[PDB]
C-alpha cells in the first residue's frame, strides 16, 4: 500500500581509458496539468539517440542507423507496442498524481538581500526559493526602474532551491530609497526590501 | 524541440563499460528525486517529502541488466565506436550571500560532463577538505551530456580561500576553480 513511482522499462535489443556509454530515458512531458501528456523513451549510444518511442507517433522510430534492427524487431511484436502505448498513463499520468501531493506543493520562501557591488550597482540576491516562478522588480522612491536593471539567469542550486541576482545601476542622491520587490508563489504578499542612500 | 509546463524522467538509466558503472535515478523539473544505490540495492530519496513513497531497487537492477545487454549489442553494431571525452565547464558559487562568521554552502557546478566519470574534490590552502562534502548524482542534459553539483559546508572567514578541483579524462590536468569572500 505505500505509493510508488512507476518506471519505464528498457526493451532488450534483438540478437585516457576507452569508454562505451548507454542511456535509457523515460521522458514525461506535461502541459496544463494532465490535459496534454507526452511520453518519449530515448535510447542513446554514447551521445547519439539511436531509437525512440514517441507516444504521439505510437511506434519505435530509428533516429540513427544503429536504431534500425531494434525499431524493426520491437515493432514486429504487438506485446511491446501494446505496452509502450500504455506507458503514457501507467508511467506519466500515474506519477503526476504523486507529484501533485509532493513536488508540485513544495514552497520555499525566497530570502531577499540588497548589497552594493565591490560602477554604482545595487545587487538584490533572491536566494533559496522553490518553485522557479519568480518576479523581481526594482524601485527608486516608489518609481519603477527598468532601463538600468540586469539579472543573472535562474541559478539551479541542485538541492531543490533556486537563486537569482537582480542588479540595478543607480546614481544615489541623499534621501533616496531603493526597493527590491519580489513576488513568488510561496508568498502571501510581495517581499519589499529597502536600501537607503 | 518540445515545450511543456513540466518535464520528468521516470527513468534516467545509465550504463558504462568503464567499471562497469551504472546509475539509476528519477528527475522532476531538472531536480534529482532519488537514486538507486546499485551496490547496496536501496533507494535513496533526495527530497524528504518523497520518503513517504517506496521504489523497488529491483526495478532499477533489471533495467541496468537490460542496458548492459543493449550496450554490448551496440558496441558490436557500431564496430566499437567509443565515447569522445568532452571538456567539463566548472563554476563555484554560494548558496547564500557571504557574511563572515555566518554558515554558508560553497556550490560547485561541473557542467558538460561526458562520459559520466569524474572526480570533484574541495581544497583549502592546497589541502583537501573532506568533511561537509556532499554531491548530487550525474543529472541528465537534453544533449545526452551530464552535470554534477558538489557542496561544502562552510563558516566563511576573510583569511580562508577554497578551490573546487575537477579531474576528468577531457582535461589535460586538474581544473582548479577558485572562490574567496
Amino acid at each position, epitope marked *: 500500500e505505500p505509493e*510508488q513511482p*512507476i*518506471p519505464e*522499462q528498457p*526493451q*532488450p535489443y*534483438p540478437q585516457s581509458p576507452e569508454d562505451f556509454v548507454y542511456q535509457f530515458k523515460g521522458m514525461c512531458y506535461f502541459t496544463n496539468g494532465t490535459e496534454r501528456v507526452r511520453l518519449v523513451s530515448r535510447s542513446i549510444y554514447n551521445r547519439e539517440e539511436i531509437v525512440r518511442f514517441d507516444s504521439d507517433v505510437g511506434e519505435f522510430r530509428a533516429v540513427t542507423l544503429l536504431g534500425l534492427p531494434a525499431a524493426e524487431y520491437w515493432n514486429s*511484436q504487438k*506485446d*511491446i507496442l*501494446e*505496452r509502450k502505448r500504455a506507458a503514457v498513463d*501507467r508511467v506519466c499520468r500515474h506519477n503526476y498524481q504523486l507529484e501533485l501531493r509532493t513536488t508540485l506543493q513544495r514552497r520555499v520562501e525566497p530570502t531577499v538581500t540588497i548589497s552594493p557591488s565591490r560602477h554604482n550597482l545595487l545587487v538584490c540576491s533572491v536566494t533559496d526559493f522553490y518553485p522557479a516562478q519568480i518576479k523581481v522588480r526594482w524601485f527608486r522612491n516608489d518609481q519603477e526602474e527598468t532601463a538600468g536593471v540586469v539579472s543573472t539567469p535562474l541559478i539551479r542550486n541542485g538541492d531543490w532551491t533556486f537563486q537569482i541576482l537582480v542588479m540595478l545601476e543607480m546614481t544615489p542622491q541623499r534621501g533616496d530609497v531603493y526597493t527590491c520587490h519580489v513576488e513568488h508563489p510561496s508568498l502571501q504578499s510581495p517581499i519589499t526590501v529597502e536600501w537607503r542612500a | 524541440d518540445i515545450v511543456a509546463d513540466h518535464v520528468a524522467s521516470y527513468g534516467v538509466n545509465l550504463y558504462q563499460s568503464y*567499471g*562497469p558503472s*551504472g546509475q539509476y535515478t528519477h528527475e522532476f523539473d531538472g531536480d534529482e528525486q532519488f537514486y538507486v544505490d*546499485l*551496490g*547496496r*540495492k536501496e533507494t535513496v530519496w533526495s527530497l524528504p517529502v518523497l520518503r513517504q513513497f517506496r521504489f*523497488d531497487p*529491483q*526495478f532499477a*537492477l*533489471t533495467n541496468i*541488466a*537490460v542496458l*548492459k*545487454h543493449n550496450l554490448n549489442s551496440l558496441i558490436k553494431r557500431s564496430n566499437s565506436t567509443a565515447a569522445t571525452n568532452e571538456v567539463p565547464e566548472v563554476t563555484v558559487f554560494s548558496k547564500s550571500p557571504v557574511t563572515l562568521g555566518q554558515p554558508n554552502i560553497l556550490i560547485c557546478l561541473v557542467d558538460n560532463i561526458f562520459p559520466p566519470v569524474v572526480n570533484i574534490t574541495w581544497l583549502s590552502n592546497g589541502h583537501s577538505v573532506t568533511e561537509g562534502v556532499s554531491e548530487t548524482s550525474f543529472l541528465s542534459k537534453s544533449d545526452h551530456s551530464f552535470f554534477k553539483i558538489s557542496y561544502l559546508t562552510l563558516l566563511p572567514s576573510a583569511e580562508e580561500s577554497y578551490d573546487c578541483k575537477v579531474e576528468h579524462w577531457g582535461l589535460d590536468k586538474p581544473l582548479l576553480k577558485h572562490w574567496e569572500p
Partner: antibody
Framework: QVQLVESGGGVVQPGRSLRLSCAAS?????????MSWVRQAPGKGLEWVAS????????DYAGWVEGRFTISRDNSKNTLYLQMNSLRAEDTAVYYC??????????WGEGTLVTVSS | DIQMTQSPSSLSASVGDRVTITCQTT??????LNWYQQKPGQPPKLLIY???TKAEGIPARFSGSGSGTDFTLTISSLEPEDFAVYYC????????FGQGTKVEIKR
C-alpha cells in the same frame, strides 16, 4: 557458446558439508552479473537459495538459509560457489545455477543432484 | 521478501483449449513479473518477461497480462508439447518463484 556447468554433487552424510561449483564460459564475471543458486527437491517447485552480484559482491539469501549456506564467486576463475554445511534430508535437491533470472537472452544450467544420505 | 501464489495448482485441458493461470504477489511489482515453463528433466525456460512481453522465439499462443499484484498467463490454444509446470517469477537478486501450476492434457 554460453553455458553454466554445475559440479560437486553426489552423496553426503547428514551433518557434513559440501561445496557446489558452477563454471561459467562464453562471458566474464567482470561484466557485472547476478549469479543465482536455485534448488528443486524431487517432485517439488523451484526454491531460490542465494544470489551474488559478481561486480560489487552483494549477496542475498533466502530467509530460511540462516547462515547454513554461503554463496561466493571468483571472477578470475569465472566460477560460482555454494558452500552448504550441516546437511539434512531436506537438502536433497537438484541444484541449478542461473544468470540474471527474468531477463531475455539469459541462461540456466542443466543441474546437479545432491543426495543427503547415510 | 515478496511472496507469490499461483492458481490453480494444476489443471487438465484438451488441445485447442484456452488455458489461464493466475499469479498474485504480496506487494506491488509494476509489470516486472515473468513466466517460466519447465518440462520434465529440463531446466526452466523463460516464456514471458515484463508481465506481457514474450521472450525471443516464444510461440504466439503464449501471452501475459497484469500489473501490481495480479497477473495472468494465457495459452490461447493448447498444444500437446505444452505439458509442463509453469512458474511466475520476480527478482534478479532477491528471487521469488510461485509454487508452480502443472498443466495436464485431456486426450
Amino acid at each position: 557458446q554460453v553455458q553454466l556447468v554445475e559440479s560437486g554433487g553426489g552423496v553426503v552424510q547428514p551433518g557434513r558439508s559440501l561445496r557446489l561449483s558452477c563454471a561459467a564460459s562464453g562471458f566474464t564475471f567482470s561484466e557485472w552479473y547476478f549469479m543465482s543458486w536455485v534448488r528443486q527437491a524431487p517432485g517439488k517447485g523451484l526454491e531460490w537459495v542465494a544470489s551474488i552480484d559478481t561486480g560489487s559482491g552483494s549477496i542475498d539469501y533466502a530467509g530460511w538459509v540462516e547462515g547454513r549456506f554461503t554463496i561466493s564467486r571468483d571472477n578470475s576463475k569465472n566460477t560460482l560457489y555454494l558452500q552448504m554445511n550441516s546437511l539434512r534430508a531436506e537438502d536433497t535437491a537438484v541444484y541449478y545455477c542461473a544468470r540474471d533470472i527474468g531477463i531475455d537472452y539469459n541462461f540456466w544450467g542443466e543441474g546437479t543432484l545432491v543426495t543427503v544420505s547415510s | 521478501d515478496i511472496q507469490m501464489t499461483q492458481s490453480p495448482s494444476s489443471l487438465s485441458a484438451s488441445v485447442g483449449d484456452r488455458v489461464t493461470i493466475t499469479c498474485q504477489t504480496t506487494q506491488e511489482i509494476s509489470s516486472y513479473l515473468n513466466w517460466y515453463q519447465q518440462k520434465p528433466g529440463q531446466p526452466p525456460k523463460l516464456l514471458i518477461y515484463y508481465a506481457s512481453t514474450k521472450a525471443e522465439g516464444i510461440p504466439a499462443r503464449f501471452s501475459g497480462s497484469g500489473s501490481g499484484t495480479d497477473f495472468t498467463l494465457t495459452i490461447s490454444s493448447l498444444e500437446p508439447e505444452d505439458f509442463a509446470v509453469y512458474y511466475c517469477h520476480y527478482g534478479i537478486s532477491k528471487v521469488s518463484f510461485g509454487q508452480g501450476t502443472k498443466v495436464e492434457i485431456k486426450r
